[PDB]
Design a protein around this ligand. Structure first.
Ligand SMILES: [Cu+]
Length: 105
């Protein structure tokens, strides 16, 4: 689609890739709510708190279906590699007031 998923399930924050563009999740917010990256870049969200979070792109944004990411526990991470330019809105599934955007340039 417009993103590929390195790992379908969450992994440890200590195992995050070098050259990784990290967005921290803390205080019930995405710490960088508007992130600008380049085509081919991998973005990694890291949950820093006890409450589970994810990222959720509705249908028609990264592809035909919705991409509802897995729930991340504390100090778990999840990556998306963006393969096409565009503006990609997302929210948190359990907490939809948490909103962010990845702009791929
Ligand atoms: Cu959340």
């Amino acid at each position: 689609d417009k993103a590929t998923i390195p790992s379908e399930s969450p992994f440890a924050a200590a195992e995050v890739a070098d050259g990784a563009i990290v967005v921290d999740i803390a205080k019930m917010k995405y710490e960088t709510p508007e992130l600008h990256v380049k085509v081919g870049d991998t973005v990694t969200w890291i949950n820093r708190e006890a409450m589970p979070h994810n990222v959720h792109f509705v249908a028609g944004v990264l592809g035909e279906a919705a991409l509802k990411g897995p729930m991340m526990k504390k100090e778990q991470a999840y990556s998306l590699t963006f393969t096409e330019a565009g503006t990609y809105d997302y929210h948190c599934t359990p907490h939809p007031f948490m909103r962010g955007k990845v702009v791929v340039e």
